[PDB]
Structures are given as structure tokens and as C-alpha cells.
């Protein structure tokens, strides 16, 4: 394989042969690709439209260079809650993660300080006083003692540094933005995974299907990279190596239609302020979206070893997510997470 | 307002740039302010999007504003270029070098523009023949005036393009940057035979020349050659007086035999030099035929600066003028005069 051959193939709008994405990504991860080559590849792959096989190779090679968590420290039924980027919804996924954990589902998240290739989220967490830059042993302790952990992308994926510098220099989202959810170093087997583009959502669902995974890959039909409350969403429901694609409408559960501007995030501080209000009981469109997506992560979680059917799973998910907020469990778990970070 | 996220986002979404965006990107590239990653991302995105004539005219215009000019009134008004944008992984540099010699020998001033090859080429072959290729503006002008031909060495006239050129080499694949050689000839000839390996990009190039009111034939071999082929038919965009006629072209209607592609190609410096010596020395075959065909196209384009003459008799007179330049010895002699001029510089 070679760069001229792989880039020529992509610029001719052709899918790569098996192994070529892996080769390129391995060159990128070993420091052997020049910044222009990295950029050429990211852009051409994006514009051809990557396939599920191509993205599985990129993600798999990247994972092979990553630091794992210590053996048998990630509970088997841990979940992730994340979007690949819009505008963004770090507000919504951060809050949903905290609520899911407060409902008793172990959560392991993965991200970087924005505007980053592997999703943001770390900034907002820092602004809440959470300690984001912890190493495997302590993320593991966090998970066992608080029920949630955060894997800081720069410490678990040091070899991704060359890709990430290119991603920053070019500014525009590429195929690399799909990698965050697919390269969580804790390897959770369940999750709610949002994406801003329907074709790329389907591609991610194909990657998760080939893993031992119970995941809802979600795309708001307004462009949101989470389940939306402004209209329908499309969901690629992934289990047992298959995909059940469906149109989802939260009006079915009593959610009023909101406006798009009402859901979008802000900076770290605005996001922290919003986390505090929602976890404190403030009702409105943001809470609703948080409850919707948390329930979504819970339904994905139930798919790992529950027999429960879609609608009953959703109804129980909504009840558990709401109760985690209304009982103060979410507020308390966030306080407990902050405490854990300070108590080192 | 322009930024790399804005421009790159627009291109990756398959959208044409807004007016002024391509110019801004090129100015960043030319001043050294673009990161290699931004340069590569731009070249690749623009290529897969499919550039427009407007976008390419902005790129070329900015590049030219950074170039070194030839001195005032040293370039004949009716000078021509003969060049292709790079064969589709197939070497046709030999042809355009020979055609240029033959065109100049027919009395039409020729000013070429290229680099040492695998980076437009042609310079390596000329060096192997004894031509001094790396000369400053005054000496190119004097070459044009005393010999009737000159060569603008790209690294000399376009030094601020080195950032882009390093990126183009690093990625290997052809991009929109490959269209720039013929559109940034520092002598700014107003006529030419310009070959392109891709039909869609040839048509784009013709729009840029049309906008400049150049008299050009942009040519695409229907076998993918960036030159008029004898292997099959060719598409030609006839550009004169700001408008563009697209035509099919069959060399068989002038009596030319069908050749094999493997015949019209050939490798490195010393073998290309030997092929030039043979053709100018009068050897017949497909190489001579392709040379005569392309020289004739340049002569037709040159005529288009004056006349808007009838197509077929323009070509017959061009084919005759090109054949005679060889068979009189005028072409072999012009090459000798060119080599002699270079040796007088010391
Ligand atoms: N996103 C990353 C992943 C790994 C190493 C460095 C980075 C970085 O932010 O530069
Ligand atoms: N092709 C070129 C044109 C101008 C300047 C440098 C180069 C170069 O090869 O580095």
C-alpha cells in the first residue's frame, strides 16, 4: 500500500480495498504520515463517504494503540452517552450521562477539551469541578466508587496526537469525528450515540453491529446529534449483530415540541450553569431532552441482557431518568463525583 | 470574512466557493501563511468538488501577482505556449517539447514554462540536449528575441509557490494545482495548445482562457492523453474572442495512421533527447506524427489571434507548416541555435 494509491482511489470516489484504511491509520498512529497526507486522507475519505468496513478499520487500528483500563475494572454493562458533534449538544450528553449514572447504570465517557476531534465534554466537566485528567487506575476507582468515569482522550490515545493536530488545523469535521464514540478506551458495550448526519449515523451503526454491542445510534431529523424534541428522530437500534432502523417520535410519550435554538449548548460556563439548573429541578425543553436521551441510554443498557421489549423499556427508562433528577440522585451523584476528585 | 473552516466546510459540502474565497486561499498559500494540512485539504477538497473556471481564474491570478514578470515589451505579442497539465500516469512531455521546437522553427514565437520533471516537466530533456533552462527574465527575453523560443523555469519565476509544490509532492495524486502551470506562464502568452488528461478539467481550463480572451486550443485525447493523440480521436475546445466551440477531432481525416499508445510514450532524459534528435533529423513514424499534429494545433491557435479562419484549411496549412519546419532542417537548426545561445551566456 501507499499514499498515492490510497488517496488516488479516494479522490476517484472509490471505496478502499480491505486493509487499506488500516494501513493508512497505522501510518498516522506511528508518526509516519506527513501532515499533508493525514489531511488529504481525512478530507478525501469524508468526501467519498466512508463505509462501515473502512471506519471499523480506522477505529480498530486506533484502539490497538490505546491504553486500556486495568483488567476487570469496567463493569460488563457500562454505557457511553455521546454525540459526534453538530452547534453542539455537550450540554445534553453531559447531563444525560450524569442522570443515567444516578439511575444506577455505570457510565464511562470519553472526550477531550474542545474544539476537539474526539467530542468535547471535558471543559463543561471541569467547569463543574470534575477532575477530568485521570489515569486508568483512578478512572477505574471512579467507576467503582461513584458509578461514572471519564477517559481523557490525550492520556488514553497519545498516539492520536498527529491526527488531532491536523484535525485542528483544518477546522472542518471529517471522518475522524466519527472515531470518538468508536474508540472509547473502556470499550463499553452499550450506549446512546448521536450523529449530526443520517448517512454517517447508519455507518456507525454498522460498525457497532459488528461488535458485541447494544447501542442506539441516534439522529434528530432536525440535524441534532442526539434524540431531539423538536421533531422526529431516526434511530438505528443495534443488537445481536443486527440493525433495526426506525422513526421515533417522543410526542408518543407526552414530550411537547420544542425549538432547536432551545436545546443547543453554549460555552463551558453556560453549560455548567445549565447542568446545575436541570439537576436542581428546572423544568423546560433542556430537561426534556436530557430525560429523553438518558432514557435512550437506559434502553440500550437494557438491551444487553434484558428481554424487555421496546415500548416497556422506553417507559421504564423515562421513569428512571426522571426519578434520578426529581429525587435529587443526579445532583448528589455529581457532588459525589466532584468530592471523589478532590479527595486525592 | 474568509477562513479555512469556512472555505473547507463549503468545499467538503460539495459547494462552489463564494467569489473571493479561492483568491484568499491562494494568497494564504503564496505568502507562507497556510499550514501544509490546510494546503492539502484545500487542494484535495477543491479537486473532488470539481473546480469552476471562476475558482481557477482566482487561483491563477493571485499566483501570477506573486510571480516575477518578463521585462516590458520583451515578449512578442503573438507568442504561444505548447503544454499539457500532466498525462494520466503516462509520460507525454517528449511531445510538447518537440512540438514547441517545431512551432518556433515555423516562425511562431514560443515561450514555455515548466520544472525539472516529476514535479509541467520538460526541463530535464532540454538540459540533456544542452539547453540552459534556468535563466532570469532578461535572458529569457533575449532568447525569445534572438532564437524565437524561451523557457521560464518555474522555481525561478514562482518562488512563492514552493509551499504548495512541497505539499503537491507529498500527496502524490493530481489535484487542481496541476491546472496552474498553463495558466500562470510568466510570459503570459495569449495563445497556445494546452492539453489536459481530464475532459471536465479541460473544459474548465477553456473557460479561464475564454475569460482572458486568449486564442487557445484546449485538447483532450479520448484515450486520456494530455496532448492531441494519433491513437484515437480527441476533444478540442476552440477558444477565441471570449467564446468556446467544443469539437471532436479525428487525425484520420488528415491521413494519419492509428498508432499504439506505447509508441507515443518514452522515459528518461537521455532517451527523450535521442527521440528529439531523431524526429528533428527527419525520422518518420508515430512520434513525428504526434509532434506534427500538436505543432499544427499551436499554429492554428496562433492564427486565431488574427483571423478566425476556417477550421479545416487552417489545420492543413498548420500541418504543412509543421512538416516543412522539420524537413527543411529548420527545426533541427533552431534547436542548435537555442543551444548556442545558452553557451554564449558565459
Ligand atoms: N485529541 C488528542 C488525542 C491524543 C493525543 C493528543 C490529542 C490532542 O488534543 O492534541
Ligand atoms: N514547482 C515549483 C514551482 C515554483 C517553485 C518551486 C517549485 C518546486 O518544485 O519546489
Query: Which residue out of B37, B86, B164, B169 would a mutagenesis test of the A interface target, given it has the greatest number of A Cβ atoms within 10 Å?
Result: B37
Report the DSSP pairing between strands B215-221 and B191-195: parallel
CB B290 within 8 A of CB B219: no
Which strands form A190-194's sheet, in the order they lie side by side? A148-152, A107-111, A79-83, A190-194, A214-220, A233-239, A242-248
Q: Does the Cβ of A157 fall within 6 Å of ligand 1?
A: yes
| Nearest-CA distance B162 → chain A (Å) | 14
CB A110 within 8 A of CB A133: no
Domains annotated for chain B, with CATH where assigned, are: 1-67 (1.20.970.10), 76-346 (3.40.1030.10)
Across the interface, whether the CB atoms of B40 and A36 are under 8 A apart is answered: yes
String of DSSP letters for B16-50:
PPPTTHHHHHHHHHHHT-S-HHHHHHHHHHHHHH-
Burial status of residue A31 (CB atoms within 10 A of its CB: 0-12, 13-18, 19 or more): exposed
B269 in reach of chain A (CB within 8 A): no
Nearest CA to ligand 1 atom 3: A154
A4 in reach of chain B (CB within 8 A): yes
B46 in reach of chain A (CB within 8 A): no
Question: What torsion do the CA atoms of B114, B120, B125, B131 make, to the nearest 10 degrees?
Answer: -10
Expressed in angstroms and rounded, the spacing between residue A165 Cα and the centre of ligand 1 is 7
* Rounded Cα–Cα distance for residues A202 and A219 (Å): 9
Closest listed residue to residue A281, CA positions, set A228, A317, A316, A328: A328
For residue A167, which ligand has an atom nearest its CA?
A: 1
Burial status of residue B245 (CB atoms within 10 A of its CB: 0-12, 13-18, 19 or more): exposed
Across the interface, whether the CB atoms of B173 and A35 are under 8 A apart is answered: no
Nearest CA to ligand 1 atom 10: A161
* Rounded Cα–Cα distance for residues B205 and B183 (Å): 8
Q: Report chain A's terminal Cα–Cα distance, integer Å.
A: 48
Q: Does the Cβ of A154 fall within 6 Å of ligand 1?
A: yes
* Rounded Cα–Cα distance for residues B340 and B185 (Å): 24
Closest listed residue to residue B287, CA positions, set B257, B321, B328: B257
Beta bridge partners of B116: none
Closest listed residue to residue A136, CA positions, set A147, A117, A149: A149
* Rounded Cα–Cα distance for residues A151 and A128 (Å): 16
* Rounded Cα–Cα distance for residues B324 and A10 (Å): 47
Q: What share of chain A is helix, strand, coil (3-state, %, to 5)?
A: 55, 10, 35
Instruction: Please provide the size of chain B in residues.
Output: 346
- Give the number of other Cβ atoms within 10 Å of residue B14's Cβ: 11
Q: Does the Cβ of A156 fall within 6 Å of ligand 1?
A: no
Nearest chain A residue to B174 by CA distance is A8
Method: X-ray
CB A152 within 8 A of CB A112: yes
| Nearest-CA distance A35 → chain B (Å) | 5
- Give the number of other Cβ atoms within 10 Å of residue B163's Cβ: 18
Atom of ligand 2 nearest to the CA of B157: 4
C-alpha cell at B153: 523555469
A115 in reach of chain B (CB within 8 A): no
**Cα–Cα distance list, A89 to A278, A293, A304, B343 (Å):** 15, 11, 26, 70
* Rounded Cα–Cα distance for residues B61 and A144 (Å): 63
B90 in reach of chain A (CB within 8 A): no
C-alpha cell at A218: 441516534
Nearest chain A residue to B3 by CA distance is A171
CB A236 within 8 A of CB A205: yes
Task: Give start and end residues of each alpha helix (H) in A49-105.
Answer: 52-64, 90-102
DSSP A113: S
Give Cβ neighbours of residue A127 (< 8 Å, ≥ 6 apart): A268, A269, A271, A272
Instruction: Please provide the size of chain A in residues.
Output: 344
| Nearest-CA distance A171 → chain B (Å) | 5
Of B4, B36, B49, the CB nearest to A36: B36
CB A246 within 8 A of CB A201: no
Q: Is B287 helix (H, G, I), strand (E, B) or coil?
A: helix
* Rounded Cα–Cα distance for residues A139 and A131 (Å): 10
Across the interface, whether the CB atoms of B8 and A34 are under 8 A apart is answered: no
Q: Which residues on A lie below 8 Å from B3 (Cβ)?
A: 171
Nearest chain A residue to B10 by CA distance is A172
* Rounded Cα–Cα distance for residues A146 and A148 (Å): 6
Expressed in angstroms and rounded, the spacing between residue B158 Cα and the centre of ligand 2 is 7
Q: Does the Cβ of A133 fall within 6 Å of ligand 1?
A: no
- B230-241 per-residue burial string, b: 16 or more CB within 10 A, e: under 16: bbbbbbbbbbbe
String of DSSP letters for B208-253:
HHHHTT-EEEEEEETTS-SS--SSS-EEEEEEETTEEEEEEE-GGG
A 132-171: CB under 8 A from B: 166, 169-171
Across the interface, whether the CB atoms of B39 and A36 are under 8 A apart is answered: yes
Q: Which residues on A lie below 8 Å from B2 (Cβ)?
A: none
Atom of ligand 2 nearest to the CA of B169: 9
Q: Is A210 helix (H, G, I), strand (E, B) or coil?
A: coil
Across the interface, whether the CB atoms of B41 and A37 are under 8 A apart is answered: no
| Nearest-CA distance B114 → chain A (Å) | 22
CB B99 within 8 A of CB B298: yes
Q: What Å resolution does this PDB entry report?
A: 2.3
Q: Match 533552462 to its residue by C-alpha cell.
A: B133
Q: Does the Cβ of A65 fall within 6 Å of ligand 1?
A: no
* Rounded Cα–Cα distance for residues B135 and B115 (Å): 12
CB A43 within 8 A of CB A175: no
Torsions phi, psi for B160 (to 5 deg): -75, -10
Atom of ligand 1 nearest to the CA of A113: 9
Which strands form B110-114's sheet, in the order they lie side by side? B149-153, B110-114, B80-84, B191-195, B215-221, B234-240, B243-249
* Rounded Cα–Cα distance for residues B21 and B2 (Å): 6
Q: Match 450553569 to its residue by C-alpha cell.
A: A273
CB B62 within 8 A of CB B26: yes
| Nearest-CA distance B186 → chain A (Å) | 28
Closest listed residue to residue B210, CA positions, set B238, B186, B182, B185: B238
Across the interface, whether the CB atoms of A11 and B35 are under 8 A apart is answered: no
Q: Does the Cβ of A119 fall within 6 Å of ligand 1?
A: no
A36 in reach of chain B (CB within 8 A): yes
Q: Is A192 helix (H, G, I), strand (E, B) or coil?
A: strand
Nearest chain B residue to A5 by CA distance is B173
A12 in reach of chain B (CB within 8 A): no
Report the DSSP pairing between strands A214-220 and A233-239: antiparallel
String of DSSP letters for B143-206:
HHHHHSEEEEEHHHH-GGGHHHHHHHHHH-S--GGGGHHHH--TT--SEEEEE-S-HHHHHHHH
Give Cβ neighbours of residue A35 (< 8 Å, ≥ 6 apart): A162, A165, A166, A169, B35, B36, B37, B40
Q: Match 476552440 to its residue by C-alpha cell.
A: B238
Of B39, B40, B173, the CB nearest to A8: B173
CB A52 within 8 A of CB A206: yes
Q: Does the Cβ of B159 fall within 6 Å of ligand 2?
A: yes
* Sign of the dihedral through C-alpha B246, B250, B255, B258: positive
B346 in reach of chain A (CB within 8 A): no
Closest listed residue to residue A45, CA positions, set A34, A54, A36: A54
CB A227 within 8 A of CB A292: yes
| Nearest-CA distance B204 → chain A (Å) | 18
Compute CA A86 distance to the chain's CA centroid, rounded to the nearest angstrom: 12
Amino acid at each position: 500500500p501507499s499514499w498515492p494509491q490510497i488517496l488516488g482511489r479516494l479522490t476517484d470516489n472509490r471505496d478502499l480495498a480491505r486493509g487499506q484504511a488500516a494501513w493508512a491509520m497505522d501510518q498516522i498512529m506511528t508518526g509516519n504520515a506527513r501532515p499533508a497526507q493525514i489531511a488529504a486522507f481525512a478530507v478525501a475519505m469524508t468526501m467519498k463517504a466512508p463505509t462501515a468496513d473502512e471506519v471499523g478499520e480506522l477505529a480498530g487500528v486506533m484502539l490497538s494503540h490505546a491504553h486500556p483500563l486495568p483488567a476487570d475494572t469496567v463493569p460488563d454493562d457500562a454505557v457511553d452517552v455521546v454525540g459526534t458533534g453538530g452547534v453542539n449538544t455537550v450540554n445534553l450528553s453531559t447531563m444525560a450521562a450524569i442522570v443515567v449514572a444516578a439511575a444506577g447504570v455505570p457510565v464511562v465517557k470519553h472526550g477531550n477539551r474542545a474544539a476537539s476531534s474526539l467530542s468535547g465534554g471535558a471543559d463543561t466537566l471541569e467547569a463543574l469541578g470534575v477532575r477530568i485528567d485521570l489515569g486508568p487506575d483512578l478512572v477505574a476507582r471512579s467507576l467503582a466508587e461513584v458509578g461514572i468515569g471519564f477517559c481523557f482522550a490525550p492520556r488514553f490515545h497519545p498516539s492520536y496526537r498527529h491526527a488531532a493536530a491536523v484535525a485542528r488545523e483544518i477546522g472542518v469535521p471529517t471522518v475522524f469525528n466519527l472515531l470518538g464514540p468508536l474508540t472509547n478506551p473502556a470499550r463499553p458495550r452499550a450506549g446512546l450515540i448521536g450523529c449530526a448526519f443520517a448517512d454517517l449515523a447508519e455507518v456507525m451503526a454498522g460498525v457497532f453491529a459488528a461488535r458485541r454491542s447494544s447501542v442506539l445510534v441516534v439522529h434528530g431529523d432536525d440535524g441534532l446529534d442526539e434524540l431531539t424534541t423538536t421533531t422526529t428522530s431516526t434511530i438505528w437500534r443495534v443488537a445481536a449483530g443486527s440493525v433495526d432502523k426506525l422513526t421515533f417520535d417522543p410526542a408518543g410519550f407526552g414530550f411537547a415540541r420544542a425549538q432547536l435554538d432551545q436545546l443547543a449548548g453554549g460555552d463551558a460556563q453556560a453549560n455548567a450553569a445549565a447542568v446545575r439548573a436541570v439537576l436542581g429541578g428546572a423544568r423546560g425543553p433542556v430537561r426534556d431532552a436530557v430525560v429523553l436521551n438518558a432514557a435512550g441510554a437506559i434502553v440500550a443498557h437494557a438491551g444487553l441482557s434484558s428481554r424487555a421489549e421496546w415500548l416497556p423499556a422506553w417507559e421504564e427508562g423515562l421513569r428512571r431518568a426522571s426519578a434520578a433528577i426529581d429525587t435529587g440522585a443526579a445532583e448528589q451523584l455529581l457532588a459525589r463525583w466532584v468530592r471523589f476528585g478532590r479527595q486525592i
